Amino acid sequence: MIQRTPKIQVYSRHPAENGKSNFLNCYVSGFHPSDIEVDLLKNGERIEKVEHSNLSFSKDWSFYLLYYTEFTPTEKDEYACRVNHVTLSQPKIVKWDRDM
């Protein structure tokens, strides 16, 4: 058996075709087993509507999740990714760096 803790990256992107759109992304990478729980948070509150969730694997024991949705950040709001996985004794919360 093998288990690996996910790497977690949280960042924003504007699609070049629609630049006034902004997306909040959580890239959760290289984890095993594939069982996982991943939420986007806004001011501590779970975001129910996340239109994109994109799972793949490389080696049979390495999984990759892109989790993202459109959003309209203000300098007031705090956003984060919250991840649960068997390798994590507590939920891991990664805050969005507003400049990323």
Side-chain angles (χ1 to χ4, degrees):
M1 66 73 78
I2 192 159
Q3 60 196 31
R4 279 155 330 111
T5 310
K7 181 185 194 61
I8 302 163
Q9 297 168 284
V10 189
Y11 53 96
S12 65
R13 298 286 186 265
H14 305 269
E17 334 86 47
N18 211 309
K20 287 174 103 54
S21 294
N22 197 5
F23 286 72
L24 176 56
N25 301 73
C26 186
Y27 184 43
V28 187
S29 60
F31 61 97
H32 199 262
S34 62
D35 303 64
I36 201 165
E37 179 171 23
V38 174
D39 286 291
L40 282 171
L41 310 181
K42 177 179 175 193
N43 302 320
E45 301 283 334
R46 179 184 168 272
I47 302 167
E48 305 169 50
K49 171 187 182 56
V50 179
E51 59 243 44
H52 289 98
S53 193
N54 267 158
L55 185 73
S56 64
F57 63 88
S58 51
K59 304 293 188 59
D60 288 337
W61 57 87
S62 199
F63 282 73
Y64 301 89
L65 171 60
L66 185 62
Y67 190 69
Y68 65 97
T69 197
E70 189 174 5
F71 81 135
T72 305
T74 61
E75 291 81 2
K76 342 303 198 79
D77 293 321
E78 298 195 34
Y79 291 91
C81 191
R82 179 180 61 203
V83 175
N84 278 293
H85 190 257
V86 289
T87 59
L88 298 169
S89 55
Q90 297 196 356
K92 190 165 180 58
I93 299 176
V94 174
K95 289 157 158 306
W96 173 53
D97 188 326
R98 204 181 52 79
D99 285 312
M100 298 183 55

